């Protein structure tokens with residue numbers, strides 16, 4: 226699959242992260258990210274996708290070595306970590322045709338796994354609106370503990 230790039234944006238307290246909500250198949254909440262274009266550098270794709278989805282330009286803030294990368298079903302997703310962005314920042318996507326809403330979420334309240342259905346003796350996982358963000362949460366919390374305190 227084609228690699229994806231984006232950002233995990235945190236506020237100044239390091240408490241909260243910015244998630245975006247799409248439509249249809251992308252109807253839940255997830256980090257801003259998207260597919261890399263031909264010959265485009267990872268940092269440029271991340272900034273591009275983040276600016277298209279949030280209206281916020283991370284180019285002056287990206288640190289090259291500060292990201293979380295996950296390979297999920299053979300697609301690689303790398304989110305650059307961008308702390309310190311004020312919570313009163315005005316985010317607006319380029320078009321409401323792709324992005325429904327943009328919100329801050331408390332990191333400590335976000336799930337870092339989906340719940341099974343053991344109550345009902347049924348296999349699998351219950352739906353969770355944070356399903357695209359979930360795989361990054363534990364690695365983010367571990368990364369913040371290491372790199373900050």
Ligand SMILES: O=C(NCc1ccc(F)cc1)c1cnn2c1CCCC2
Nearest residue numbers: 245246247250251254255258323357
């Ligand atoms: O990325 C997602 N959500 C946030 C988002 C990011 C960019 C955007 F333009 C709109 C919403 C998402 C949700 N479900 N799927 C995805 C991606 C691929 C697998 C299905």
